[PDB]
């Protein structure tokens, strides 16, 4: 039974219930993520920015079945075009806006990757992606407002691929945590 998360801590408790089993009800998880009303005091601990690129800040390690982290995007910071390593990926805005651009999986032939669509993800909205849907880039295109997003991945993964927009060629990238549980992890 899906109730509105009252706080971030309540959301985490609810997520532990929703991932108690071996499968994932994507629509339920997205709904509860969306229903949490971002409260900046509850996540300030995790919102550790870097001047030069976006940061990944682990919030909860889940139950063997998911990670939950907060990404902090300075003005103009963005990601690669990337996949999600056969995992579910949910992205909820906690502050600001992000542009999500969708791409199809490239063919083996070297070719420009042409965007299939784009949208602006706004505060409190929750998006979802997986490899069956396609690839995406996420960017804070604002010149004046940092963005903060809440990401849930299931199963957890710490590698993925970045895709060269010019060719479709991919390279494996190892993903690192800027902090874990509020502690900077150099
Ligand atoms: Cl993402
Ligand atoms: Fe992603």
- Sign of the dihedral through C-alpha 57, 74, 124, 41: positive
Which CATH number do you get for residue 103?
Answer: 2.60.120.10
Helix axes 8-18, 26-35, angle to 10 degrees: 170
* Partner residues linked to 89 by β-bridges: 129, 153
Burial of 130 (0-12, 13-18, 19+ CB in 10 A): middle
Instruction: Note down the domain range covering 33.
Output: 1-186
- Phi/psi at 84 (nearest 5 deg)? -135, 25
Total of domains in the chain: 1
Ligand 1 centroid, distance to 108 Cα (angstroms): 24
CA of 46 to the centre of ligand 2 (A): 19
Among candidates 126, 128, 130, 152, which has minimal Cα distance to 16?
Answer: 152
Binding residues for Fe cation: 82, 84, 136
Give the largest Cα separation in the chain, rounded.
49
Give 156 Cα–ligand 2 centroid separation in angstroms. Answer: 13
Q: Measured in angstroms, how far is the CA atom of residue 136 from the centroid of ligand 1?
A: 8
Partners of residue 98 on adjacent β-strands: 121
DSSP per residue, 116-154: -EEEEE-TT-EEEE-TTT-EEEEE---SS--EEEEEEEE
């Amino acid at each position: 039974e899906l109730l509105k998360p009252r706080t971030l801590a309540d959301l985490i408790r609810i997520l532990h219930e929703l991932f108690a089993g071996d499968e994932v009800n994507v629509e339920e998880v997205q709904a509860v993520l969306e229903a949490y009303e971002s409260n900046p005091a509850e996540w300030a601990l995790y919102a550790k920015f870097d001047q030069y690129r976006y940061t990944r800040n682990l919030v909860d390690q889940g139950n063997g079945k998911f990670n939950l982290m907060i990404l902090c995007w300075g003005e103009g910071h963005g990601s690669s075009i990337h996949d999600h390593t056969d995992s579910h990926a949910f992205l909820k805005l906690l502050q600001g806006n992000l542009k999500e651009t969708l791409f199809d999986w490239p063919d083996k032939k070297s070719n420009e990757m042409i965007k299939k669509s784009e949208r602006t993800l706004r505060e409190n909205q929750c998006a979802y992606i997986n490899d069956s849907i396609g690839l995406h880039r996420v960017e804070n295109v604002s010149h004046t407002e940092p963005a903060v997003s809440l990401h849930l991945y299931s199963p957890p993964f710490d590698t993925c691929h970045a895709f060269d927009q010019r060719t479709g060629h991919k390279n494996k990238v190892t993903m690192t945590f800027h902090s874990k549980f509020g502690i900077r992890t150099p």
